[PDB]
Enzyme design. Structure first.
Site: not given
Ligand SMILES: Cc1cc2c3c(c1C)C(C)(C)C[C@@H](O)N3c1c(nc(O)[nH]c1=O)N2C[C@H](O)[C@H](O)[C@H](O)COP(=O)(O)O
Ligand SMILES: O=C(O)/C(F)=C/c1ccccc1
Ligand SMILES: [K+]
Ligand SMILES: [Mn+2]
Ligand SMILES: Cc1cc2c3c(c1C)C(C)(C)C[C@@H](O)N3c1c(nc(O)[nH]c1=O)N2C[C@H](O)[C@H](O)[C@H](O)COP(=O)(O)O
Ligand SMILES: O=C(O)/C(F)=C/c1ccccc1
Ligand SMILES: [K+]
Ligand SMILES: [K+]
Ligand SMILES: [K+]
Ligand SMILES: [Mn+2]
Lengths: 500, 500
Positions: A165-166, A168-169, A188, A230, A279, A388
């Site tokens: 999995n790839w 952003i968190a 994920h 991904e 956030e 999800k």
């Molecule tokens: C584009 C983007 C996405 C996310 C986030 C940010 C950006 C810029 C931060 C600025 C870092 C803020 C943050 O809250 N953040 C974030 C996050 N998901 C989380 O679990 N935890 C996070 O801390 N997502 C959303 C996830 O990237 C998506 O929900 C994605 O669907 C996850 O991938 P997957 O689990 O489906 O593989």
């Molecule tokens: O840190 C944040 O502002 C953020 F958007 C987290 C997040 C977003 C989507 C899903 C889960 C967490």
């Molecule tokens: K993803």
């Molecule tokens: Mn995924």
């Protein structure tokens, strides 16, 4: 390499597009870089490239802010997202989301392993780096840490090797060799973490790659299905196998052209303080620190003159709106269609702080279902809010075919005039809720459950015989010939360009 | 005479403001005048003055469209409304609404009777006019009649003589000497009609004056209290007694400078077909004709070169938004304060199609009440939704002191992020509903009852100890000195006027 496959080329593309401001004088990563970026995001200005960051040493690092934010002009509003994907800069959101969904019924194109790449130009072992000595930004004045990770891709793999999995968190520096970050259900990274925790034998091999191929960071931000790697999805979407190189200290594979790579482990036992963070919904609650997941960094590799992308997130408009909201909406559109629901389009209006998704209904198909609002609303909400892809979304607005869901003004019009509060809505209290919304985690009810609604902005005859109104607007309330006459005589008479 | 006291001078003021387009070539009142006006309203262009209206004869009539619509510039956005009131053209909506409320705790200044005025320059008796022969506009292609009356003031008086009401209510031509129109509860024209019907002896003496003093048409559009004669309220607001002249065929009094006056009766027994009409929420339902009230016209008097104002209403933004919504909101603000509720400001967001009112709460005062969301929401909704001032409003949004309710983006942000659907809301099903909203009169429930909600976008600590967040925005998430530095260096660095 192409801009959508190489971050360094993406930066050049922004320059060529007259969409970049290079700042070559010293800028402080303590708030100043993020303040500039915040201002950019609130005004849809050019992306800032901080080439002279106070504290950068030995090539680590420059910062690019606002990589996925909006441009001012209507014509190329979404041009930064188009440049993630090899699309023309005038691409519509429908075209961007269609591109992001295109791989969903294609065979994956697995990645290609290559022996080296730019991300191996420099390295620092466990004795040579200190994360507290890097120019990591303080993004918001009340953040609980310096958030190194706002636009990199975490890489983790299931214990059995079958799913990589790839995603952003967020993550922030904890100490010289650790980060803390969010790892929460149903994401994920959390699902995979739980697999390793149940096995109980070791910490999770991990890498975090910054400045990855733009097409890859888009997929990293999208809730593609469970179990889907991904890399192969991005391969299919782009028509090209992504080139990856092995980490030095583990057997994960990172994009060859990654700007910066951290290698290490995500603990199955340890936690540390994480947050608060300004956030996506526009808030920070100063002092709300919680325990988060803890990552140990064993190695850093990086390109010469490495660039760290950064999201200065908060109030409209940034990556957390353009990417989280839109990409969730895309997945929701597909999910609905796969559940035989007559949805043609979905979008998370920015006005809703991307907490709503508007679902455009093919009302011809709806009529053939011979259903009612109560029944249909329940069906839609059950599909979306139990999945999800619906996690972040608290209100679904059903609209008929006359509404362009990509236009927030029209969604707001339809919601406000077609959905009777209460009667035309169904509340969902026994679904997973998104705690980051203030009214959830800082609200009056359970942080993690409920607070969701389907709002039916379909009018009654849309279920039966067809639309029974005309809009009281210029378009619909005047014949074609008259409209054209008015338009043709507009400037003659004394009244007042597309690119702008 | 001043612009706020004389419509003809108001037109000159719009000219001087470079806010008027005079169209001196022939324009058709069948759709074309209204189409131009519609386009103006949808684009915030200059008001159109149709000086050469196909079918104008013997001075009846020219048309001014969009008299109370928006200007393009932010700085003088509300300048047309300011020109109704002698306010500077840059007046804020707070200042406009304060002006409209100012007379509420002043002694009335009753009108002055004068022997003649411009409105007596020409006359037509019962043998000399035919309403079907005047250049009355067809405003929307599916309207059920030619709506002569979209911006005049109906004048009716209680049987006992003690209350003379001025109000806008639509009316269309029925035949050579009758109109039909809306006369619906709880409106004061309806309340007075019911008094005459209970007495049972005669039809209601009536006059309809077009092109009245602008300050008077504003009060005509505002739900000032039951029993309050608008003329004396406008007198107090403007500091001047309004000059009125007696009708020729009845003993009602009309503004001396009225452009056009119809004299006659509102029947206590007769009805006729009325509507459909392209209405304030943005819709017409073609073929939904209903019986409306029937007015008989016995006399027309008018100024030389008379001008009829016209509202081409529908989708944003026109008089039905700027005046109905804002003026109801003003009255609601006062009503709340008179009921000891800690409301500082109220506005009907345009984005809501003026179906919501956002109420800004003085949260210091709220905290001293030692109350809870459920209790407070119930109290607010009981006050507002049981009162005539709340008639048109279906959703109240409670917001704290950080929100500017005159900024729809901020209201939408607060609503979407601070009010948990269901739990933070109270539905009101046993209140009067506004049937013109599509989800009411053309919806799934009772047209005339319910469908209202109070949505609490106050966060929990706003009731207890105080706001516990900072916004993740440029303003709140960076120190003052840094913000100023960023602003001072903005153009140096390479990034991008108030009047625009
Ligand atoms: C584009 C983007 C996405 C996310 C986030 C940010 C950006 C810029 C931060 C600025 C870092 C803020 C943050 O809250 N953040 C974030 C996050 N998901 C989380 O679990 N935890 C996070 O801390 N997502 C959303 C996830 O990237 C998506 O929900 C994605 O669907 C996850 O991938 P997957 O689990 O489906 O593989
Ligand atoms: O840190 C944040 O502002 C953020 F958007 C987290 C997040 C977003 C989507 C899903 C889960 C967490
Ligand atoms: K993803
Ligand atoms: Mn995924
Ligand atoms: C500014 C404005 C006000 C109104 C209207 C219009 C404009 C431009 C129309 C374009 C003609 C459309 C129409 O639907 N219309 C209208 C109407 N009130 C009605 O009972 N009936 C109507 O047909 N109001 C609203 C009323 O003017 C206010 O509710 C006012 O408060 C009434 O006065 P009162 O009963 O409080 O004395
Ligand atoms: O005809 C209309 O569009 C209209 F807004 C009518 C109305 C407005 C407010 C109160 C009552 C009726
Ligand atoms: K509905
Ligand atoms: K009135
Ligand atoms: K709340
Ligand atoms: Mn009144």
């Amino acid at each position: 390499q192409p801009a959508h496959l190489c971050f360094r080329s993406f930066v050049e593309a922004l320059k060529v597009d007259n969409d970049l401001v290079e700042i070559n004088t010293p800028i402080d990563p303590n708030l100043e870089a993020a303040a500039i970026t915040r201002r950019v995001c609130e005004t849809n200005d050019k992306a800032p490239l901080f080439n002279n960051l106070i504290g950068m040493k030995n090539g680590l690092f420059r910062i690019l802010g606002a990589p996925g934010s909006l441009r001012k002009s209507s014509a190329d509003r979404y041009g930064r997202l188009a440049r993630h994907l090899a699309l023309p800069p005038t691409a519509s959101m429908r075209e961007i989301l269609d591109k992001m969904l295109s791989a969903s019924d294609m065979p994956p194109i697995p990645p290609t392993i290559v022996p080296t790449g730019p991300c191996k130009e420099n390295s620092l072992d466990d004795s040579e780096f200190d994360l507290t000595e890097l120019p990591v930004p303080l993004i918001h004045k009340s953040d609980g840490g310096k958030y190194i990770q706002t636009y990199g891709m975490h890489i983790v793999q299931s214990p059995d090797g079958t799913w990589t999995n790839w995603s952003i968190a967020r993550a922030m520096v904890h100490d010289k060799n650790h980060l803390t970050g969010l790892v929460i259900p149903p994401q994920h990274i959390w699902q995979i973490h739980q697999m390793w925790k149940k096995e109980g034998r070791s910490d999770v091999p991990w890498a975090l790659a910054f400045g990855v191929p733009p097409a890859a960071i888009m997929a990293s931000s999208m809730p593609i299905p469970d179990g889907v790697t991904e890399a192969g999805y991005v391969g299919a979407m782009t028509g090209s196998s992504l080139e990856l190189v092995k980490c030095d200290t583990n057997d994960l594979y990172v994009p060859a052209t990654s700007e910066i790579v951290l290698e290490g482990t995500l603990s199955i036992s340890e936690t540390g303080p994480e947050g608060p963070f300004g956030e996506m919904h526009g808030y920070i609650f100063p002092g709300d620190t919680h325990l988060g997941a803890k990552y140990k960094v064993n190695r850093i590799t990086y390109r010469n003159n490495a660039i760290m992308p950064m999201s200065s997130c908060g109030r409209l408009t940034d990556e957390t709106h353009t990417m989280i909201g839109s990409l969730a909406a895309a997945e929701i559109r597909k999910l609905c269609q796969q559940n035989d629901l007559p949805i043609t389009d979905a979008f998370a209006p920015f006005e809703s702080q991307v907490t709503w998704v508007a679902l455009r209904v093919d009302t011809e198909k709806l009529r053939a279902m011979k259903t009612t609002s109560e029944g249909f609303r329940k069906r839609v909400g059950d599909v979306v809010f139990n999945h999800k892809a619906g996690y972040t979304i608290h209100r679904l607005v059903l609209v008929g075919d006359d509404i362009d869901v990509y236009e927030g003004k029209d969604v707001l019009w339809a919601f406000s005039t077609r959905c009777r509060p209460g009667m035309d809505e169904t509340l969902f209290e026994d679904v997973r809720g998104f705690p980051l919304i203030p009214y959830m985690g800082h609200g009056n009810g359970p942080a993690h459950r409920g607070g969701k609604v389907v709002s039916d902005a379909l009018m009654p005859t849309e279920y039966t015989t067809g639309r029974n109104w005309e809009a009281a607007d210029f378009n619909q309330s005047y014949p074609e010939d008259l409209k054209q006459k008015v338009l043709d005589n507009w400037t003659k008479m004394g009244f007042s360009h597309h690119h702008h």
